[PDB]
Amino acid sequence: YDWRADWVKGFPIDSSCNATQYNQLSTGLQEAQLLAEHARDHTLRFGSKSPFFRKYFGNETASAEVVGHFDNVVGADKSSILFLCDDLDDKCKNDGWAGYWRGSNHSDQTIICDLSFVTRRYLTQLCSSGYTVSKSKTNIFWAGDLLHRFWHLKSIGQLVIEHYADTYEEVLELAQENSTYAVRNSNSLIYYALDVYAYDVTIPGEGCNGDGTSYKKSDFS
Amino acid sequence: YDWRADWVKGFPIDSSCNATQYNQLSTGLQEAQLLAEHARDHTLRFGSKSPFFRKYFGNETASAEVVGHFDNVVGADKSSILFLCDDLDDKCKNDGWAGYWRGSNHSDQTIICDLSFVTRRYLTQLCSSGYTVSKSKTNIFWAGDLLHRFWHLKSIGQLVIEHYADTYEEVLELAQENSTYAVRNSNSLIYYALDVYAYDVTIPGEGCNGDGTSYKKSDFS
Amino acid sequence: YDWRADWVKGFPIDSSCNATQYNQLSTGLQEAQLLAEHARDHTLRFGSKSPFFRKYFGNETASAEVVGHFDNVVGADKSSILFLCDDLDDKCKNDGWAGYWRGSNHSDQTIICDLSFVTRRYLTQLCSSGYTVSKSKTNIFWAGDLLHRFWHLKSIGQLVIEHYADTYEEVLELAQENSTYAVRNSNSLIYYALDVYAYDVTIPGEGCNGDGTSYKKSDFS
Amino acid sequence: YDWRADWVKGFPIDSSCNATQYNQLSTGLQEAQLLAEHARDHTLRFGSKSPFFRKYFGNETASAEVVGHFDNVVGADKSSILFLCDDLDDKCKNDGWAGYWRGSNHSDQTIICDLSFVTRRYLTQLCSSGYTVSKSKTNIFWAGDLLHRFWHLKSIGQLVIEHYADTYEEVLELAQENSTYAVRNSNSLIYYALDVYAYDVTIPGEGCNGDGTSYKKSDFS
Amino acid sequence: YDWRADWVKGFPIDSSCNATQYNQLSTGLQEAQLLAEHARDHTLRFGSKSPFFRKYFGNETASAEVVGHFDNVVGADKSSILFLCDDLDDKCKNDGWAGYWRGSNHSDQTIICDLSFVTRRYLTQLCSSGYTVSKSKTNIFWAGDLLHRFWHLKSIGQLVIEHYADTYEEVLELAQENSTYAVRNSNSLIYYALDVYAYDVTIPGEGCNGDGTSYKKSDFS
Amino acid sequence: YDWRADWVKGFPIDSSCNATQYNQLSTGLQEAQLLAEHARDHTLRFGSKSPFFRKYFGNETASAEVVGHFDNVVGADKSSILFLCDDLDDKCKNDGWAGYWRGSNHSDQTIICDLSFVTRRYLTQLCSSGYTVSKSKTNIFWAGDLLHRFWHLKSIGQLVIEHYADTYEEVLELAQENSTYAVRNSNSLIYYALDVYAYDVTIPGEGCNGDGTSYKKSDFS
Ligand SMILES: [Zn+2]
Ligand SMILES: [Zn+2]
Ligand SMILES: [Zn+2]
Ligand SMILES: [Zn+2]
Ligand SMILES: [Zn+2]
Ligand SMILES: [Zn+2]
């Protein structure tokens, strides 16, 4: 049994999407996977010697679960997962909804409404038009919005990633008060990934956190 | 700060070892890293759908820490680890000692005695001369002996992997009774890695566990 | 004298633009070059045997100048060209201006205003949100807007490409009336490139021209 | 319709030629294509900044048609072109005829007589045995002789390349007098290609023009 | 007849060997081929300018047959050679036998006994545990033992390599006295290969000959 | 001492040769090495199983010296060899002299006269214009003319290759009469190389020997 020949590592898309919807959805999925890969590489390189890891997960926390989560996002068998462009449950009618998870009956399926193809942004425009990591919402860009959808699936989240803290202040408090549940909080991982990508790639050496902190090379040792 | 050009992913060796000792220690370390990489790949491909994972870690356990540990072994900054061939603590004189960890004063240093160069075997001789995974000691080969030494280092183990169960039957009981602690047990990881390597590479489809179990393709779904 | 070593094929950007502006300007310039390369490949493969060429340039026109223009855009010495973000001529104050050519005193220089970083789209969103090649403006996307700016530079356009027809109907009439002058017309070239890219890549086999014409494989021979 | 998998970029040869004629004809065609490619690259790098372009095409002529002709020779669909080794019109009986074009009834076919396999040289012998570009005939080598045959075919010449000036002095006059017609003159392109190849590859920095001119690095700026 | 598509340069193994026997036999054969390749490269690089060649083959001997032997080992066609783990002659009961050549009736077949899978060592352990090239037997390692069995095969030895000198002193005397038969002597080639490999790879600059001779870079000129 | 970093495998040329002389001589030197490599590959693939080997070296002759001779030409240190275009010994004045060996005082040097640049042919014209291997002279082409010069050098020939037979009939008699000196005869090797190249590449399956022999696939077994 050569299981290396059936290994699917990309997110499948259903046939309910036409050409133009497919073109943008695939690009968004690729950008989300790229963000996850960069986060995993940063974690492997530094660990708890990084101020970002220290402030999002704890001062003396072990980095194995974070690496495992990001590596599961990057490479794993995505054969039961399907992304659809069809409103089967009749829920896109609500005001301000760009998609939803199908629920427990179909725990590996998710729906994308038409607002996503009008409001979501791409990674080349990060930290522009007044955007900051700590003051704006996390679903403005394709990558941070699809990372949130991934955590709800059964093959990726595995029924351990939940919503323990949502605001930036609550996330900072949970980092230092409860480090056991900080590594499985939904918003902490997204904040960490966005911050490290902005610091390493977009504006090298500065980032765009926007809360009054600046980190140098002496903070990494 | 380009930290991608400052990244060290191999285990350094001190100059106390001459050419002959270096030649064999390097090969042993490479074999240990290869075993860790294959274990990571098997975990990422299957998770809790494979019978080996179910029998060593639990029927419905999440595979994040297991991936993280082997990924830390494969890729991480080994800039503070050192392997020495010099008896700095006068402990190779004991009976049957092939090495020791230097302890809390030097948490990233290991010493190798002369017995290892005459007793340790190589991966091409697996499942031969009457060896079985479950009935023989885990330190007969270089890879399984060095995996156990990796778990004591501060940069790899991070003070969470310990000895909760050592015997095969105790490991089997821990897998089903206390699943939270059977992801940070030293012997469970080594048994899992040795069992999944021999089933996939050494004797494809059969393995050499030698306890009375046979698994087919229908058990992986 | 090895002139293959100091051969610059990309478009230089001045230091007046900060990191955020640079990130988007580079992507726009690369997309324009990619569009020109695809147009060149289509022209070389077919010539006057394709309906797009016949309806934009003439039924029996020779395809040499058309190939040469796109080849000059793709590969040539861009050593005297500079793109700036400073308003050195005090012209961005005008309503609806996204940039301007510096003129005959500085024939290889051009200025980009801030409206560009707010209204320009990317190639992954082509033929969406009601966009139509025949009915919309040619400067909605980054690539079509920068191709028009390329024709004004001294080293690319070489003082032969002008404005002979601007609307779609005028271009269509010029194709059949004056074939000698509809090979150095800016709008003709931009329309041709956008049409062939939309037909070949975005919606394979259909395109998004939106004028009531549909071409099959039998029209290419 | 994937037209990139149906693209033919080499010149086909009929089955009339035996094993020995094919071997030499293929090498001749390859050398002609290589010469065209080098001429295209020199034009793309320099334009009207090189003295060779200035002396063959005009002091301030635009380089788009010149690039397009050589690019058409290098890469284009050669699917209806055929080279034959069989006398079908009974014309090889003439004195000094090494081949001919089949005419308007068969606009994409050429015939090669037996003198070609006796009196044609290779690119490794350029500028030797007293040969000069200005004082010798242009059909002495395979590469310069097949380029002249390419201009007569319908899929490459496209009925725009003609004989307006044959001798070297008339070629030099046409460049300064009528630059509109000295871009579609058969002999100007061949002289240009041979001169730039000899200057760049055969004898770097000197060439073998044999006219009385010596160009330095300061002439290219 | 394209004979490049059916060219076999590896030694085939019969299906009478199970998985564990196959795994070790393949590694041994590969190591033997690697040793032969290194010997060929050393001979080509130096010839009679190296002290090892001088001391094993003669002070003024020509090096063509020595190169040809190792090249035949590395890259001749091996489609009629077979290695078997089946005792078809009842010769395993002889004390101390690890294998035997099948004889003149089957001149291209060899049998491997079970004693070989317990005693033979690997190239990573060369010059260790008190081993010296001059004083130990040549069949201690897989490569040296398997090289001696190739000289008996009809496709490799070709009925010209024999046993003229067996001990080290007789080999050293044959090198200086009878140079015409030193290039056809079985033990001389193995001694030469082991010496050059130990000097070049295992202990760079010193080797492990163990007879009191040390060579520097000035002896190679 | 890393001797793989200063390994020279091409034939050096002196500064006494101008640009055109260098251009022609380097190509001539490369063609001979290509021919030698093909001859070595044919010998390794077949040995005495091919009818070309049997007719030039003997029915049951071993093939190691032939392989070594061609391998020394293909890959070996050539740092003491030099080719010159200056007539230092005053010998480029006799009728029909295209070069000469400098003799025992300078045994690694060769002079090339001016007839070589006028008379020698290239491998693309093999078996044409009435050429046959057995009825024409050996030195008509660059490759066969330079293979004869290689055998006189001290670093390649090594004072064992001589002139024992010159005509085709004598060469054929020597193979069956005296097989020990046929493998070190200058003309036998060149005849064998030319024959196998013409049979394998120039006219696949037929060759151009021109003596009334035809070999099929059944002859190679
Ligand atoms: Zn959620
Ligand atoms: Zn322990
Ligand atoms: Zn304009
Ligand atoms: Zn003509
Ligand atoms: Zn023997
Ligand atoms: Zn001679």
Residue numbers in the entry:
A (entry chain E), B (entry chain F), C (entry chain D), D (entry chain C), E (entry chain A), F (entry chain B): 31 to 251
Structure paper excerpt:
In response to such conditions of low zinc availability, C. albicans secretes a zinc-scavenging protein called Pra1 to capture zinc from the host. Following extracellular secretion, Pra1 associates with the fungal cell via a cognate receptor called Zrt101; the PRA1 and ZRT101 genes are encoded at the same genetic locus. In this study, we present cryo-EM structures of C. albicans Pra1 in the apo-state as well as in the zinc-bound state at 2.8 Å and 2.5 Å resolution, respectively. The structure reveals a hexameric ring-like assembly in which each subunit is related to its neighbor by a 180° rotation.
In this subunit (subunit B), the center of the zinc ion is equidistant to the center of the N3-nitrogen in the imidazole ring of each histidine residue. There is an extension of cryo-EM density in the metal ion binding site, likely indicating the presence of a water molecule to complete the tetrahedral coordination of the zinc ion. Although we generated two final maps for the Pra1:Zn2+ structure, one with c1 (no symmetry) and the other with three-fold c3 symmetry imposed, we analyzed and deposited the c1 map. The lack of metal ion coordination, and the change in pH, does not lead to global conformational changes in the resolved portions of Pra1.
